[model samples]
Target chain A: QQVWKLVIITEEILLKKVSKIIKEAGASGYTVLAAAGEGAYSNIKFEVLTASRELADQIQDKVVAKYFDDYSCITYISTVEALRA
Target chain B: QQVWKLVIITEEILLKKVSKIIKEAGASGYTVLAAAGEAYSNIKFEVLTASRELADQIQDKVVAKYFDDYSCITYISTVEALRAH
Candidate 1:
C-alpha cells in the first residue's frame, strides 16, 4: 500500500489545536513530539499519515487557514510505501 | 529548501539505539514521539536532511543491525516543496 504523510512543525501553542483538527478530520492516527530548533525556537512536530491525498490536503488547508498568519509553521506532504491498505 | 525525510517506526525499546545511529550519521536534528501502537507500541523518528543517500545510509544501518530481531519499518520520502510561515 501507499499513503501520504503530512509533516507539520509549528509553535508549541498550536499543538493541541492542530492535533484536534487531524483527529476530527478522520485520520487513522498521528504522532507528535515536543522539539526545538537549535536554541531559538520551540515547536511541536506532528506526523499524520492518510490513505489519500484528499484528506491530507484537507487537513493541511485548515492548518494554513487557521494559523499561518500569526504562527511560525512549516507544512509539507510526502508519500510512503505501506505494508497494508 | 527541498529535502528528504526519513521516517522510522520501531519498537519503543529501541529508541536509544535508533537515535544513536541518526545522530552519529550526522543528522543535524530529528524528532521522536511515542507512536500510537499500530502493531507494536513504537517510537517514530523523523529526520530531515539534504541528501536521500544519507537517508538511505541511515536506514541501512538501522535495518541491517536491528530489523531481524525487532519490529521495525522505515522509508524515505522526498519533500520537494513546503510552506513556512
Candidate 2:
C-alpha cells in the first residue's frame, strides 16, 4: 500500500508524550529509537506511517505545534510503498 | 537534493547485523528504532541515499541473506530532505 511516512526527531525525554500524541492522532503504530548523538531533541527519532496524507500532516503539525517552541524538532513527510509477505 | 529513503523492517536481534549491512552498502547515514507496541517487537532501519543503485544493493544484500531465516520487509521512497536535518 502507498503511504505517507512522517519522520519526527525530538528529545528522548518526550518519548512517552510523543507516543501518546501519535496514538491519539489515530496512527496504527510507529517506530522509535534513541539517536546516536549528543543533543536533546535529536536524541529521539520517530517514524510514523499513515495511509492518509492528512493523517500524516496532522500528526506532524500536532507535534510541531506542541513542542517545536521549546524543543528542537525536525518533521517531514515522504511517500512509501509498504511491502509484506 | 533528493534521495531514496530505504526502510528495513526485521527482528530486533538483527540490529547490529543490519547496521553492519547498511554501513557496508555505503549509505551516508541511517536511523534505527524499536517498533512501538508490546506485541510488535521489531527493528526499523531508515537509510537515506542519493543513489538508487546503492539503495537496492543494500536491500538485496539484506534480503538475500536474511529472508530465509529471518523476517524482513524493505521498501524505498523518495525524499527531498534538507542537508542539515
Candidate 3:
C-alpha cells in the first residue's frame, strides 16, 4: 500500500501531546528530532508514516486544531513509496 | 540558491559514520531523531543543503555503503524557503 509522510515542525513542549495524537490516530510509528529554524532553538520536528492520506490528515487536523493558532508551527504532507520487508 | 532537504533513515549504529559523510559532502547541518521502524530501532536524519548535488552525493554514498546490509531508506524534497543562521 502507498504511504504518506507527514511532517510537523512545532514547539518542543508539545512533543508528548503530539505523539499521543499520532498514536491515537492509528499510525504504526513516528520519529521526532530536535530542530532549530527561523532563529529558534526550541523546536521539534516529527515524521510520521501513515497507511493512508486520511490517517495523515486526521493527525494533522488534530495538531492544527489545537495548536496552530497559538503556537509557532508548520505542517505539510508528501507521498512516500513503501519498501516492505 | 535552492536547497534540498535530504532525509536518511538507517541503523542507529551508523549515526556517526553518516554524519561524517554529510559533513564531508559540504552540508551545513543535519538533525537526527531516534526512530523505530518495521523491525528495528533506527535513526531519522534530516539534512538541509544548499546544493541538490551535495544532497544527492550524500544519499548516494550512504545508500551505496549500507543499503544492502542495513534497514534504511531515503528521499529528497525541495525546501520552499529556508532561512538559516
Candidate 4:
C-alpha cells in the first residue's frame, strides 16, 4: 500500500506541543523544520510519513481540529512510497 | 472550500528561487523551515493555503515548472480552512 505523508505548517511556538502530539499518536518519529511565512505569526512545518492512510488522517484531524480553533495552523497530506522500517 | 498546503523537499540553494515562484504566483506569503533529511539532499516545504483552487494551482504550476526537473521534490494537498489578509 502507498503511504500517506502529513505536512503540518503552523506557528513555531507550537512546535513542542505539536511534536508531542505526533509522538503520542504512535508515530516512530517526526521531522521539524523552521519556516517563515506571510501569516499573522511565524511557522514551522511537520512531516509525518505513515504507511497507513488511516493513521495519517487521524494525525491530521487531531492537530487541526485541536488547534485551528485557537491556533494559527494548517495541515495537509500527500501520498508516498515507504518501507515500514 | 478548504485551504491547500504544498510541501517541497529539495536542495537548500534553491530556496530563493522557489520562494520567489511562490510569491510571483500570487501567494501573499509562505513559511520556510530549515530541514535535514536522509535523501543525500537538504529539503524545504512550501505551504500554500488558498480559497480558490486556481490560486493554489497557479502557485504549484510555477514551482514544478521551474524546479522539478533541476530542483527538489514538490507535492500538494488540502485540509480544514484558511483566511487571506
Best by lDDT: 1
State the lDDT at A74 in candidate 2.
58
At residue B52, candidate 3 shows an lDDT of 85
* Stretches of candidate 4 exceeding 4 Å from the true structure: A39-41, B1-25, B34-85
TM-score of chain A of 2: 0.85
State the iRMSD of every prediction, in order shown.
Answer: 4.9, 5.5, 6.8, 4.6
lDDT of 4 by residue, A1-85 (tens): 7867777778787888888788888874678766666522266778888777788778777787678778667666666665566
**lDDT-superior candidate, 3 or 4:** 3
Error of 4 at A18 (Å): 1.2
Q: Higher TM-score: candidate 2 or 3?
A: 2
DockQ (model 2, Cα):
0.13
Q: Write the per-residue lDDT of candidate 1 for residues B2-57, one digit (tens) a residue.
A: 78878888997897778788888898457665666534367778787778889899
> Chain B vs. true chain B: TM-score for each candidate?
0.85, 0.88, 0.91, 0.66
Every model's DockQ, to 2 decimals? 0.25, 0.13, 0.09, 0.31
User: Candidate 1, chain A: TM-score?
Assistant: 0.88
Superposed by TM-score, candidate 4 places the C-alpha of residue B72 at a distance from the truth, in angstroms, of 10
Docking class of predicted structure 1: acceptable
Candidate 3 local lDDT, B1-85, one digit each (tens): 4668899989889977887888777776576767788543687888877788988889999999999998888999975334332
List ranges where model 3 is wrong by over 4 Å.
Answer: A1-43, A46-85
* Candidates 2 and 3 compared by DockQ, better number: 2
Tell me, by TM-score, which candidate is best. Answer: 4
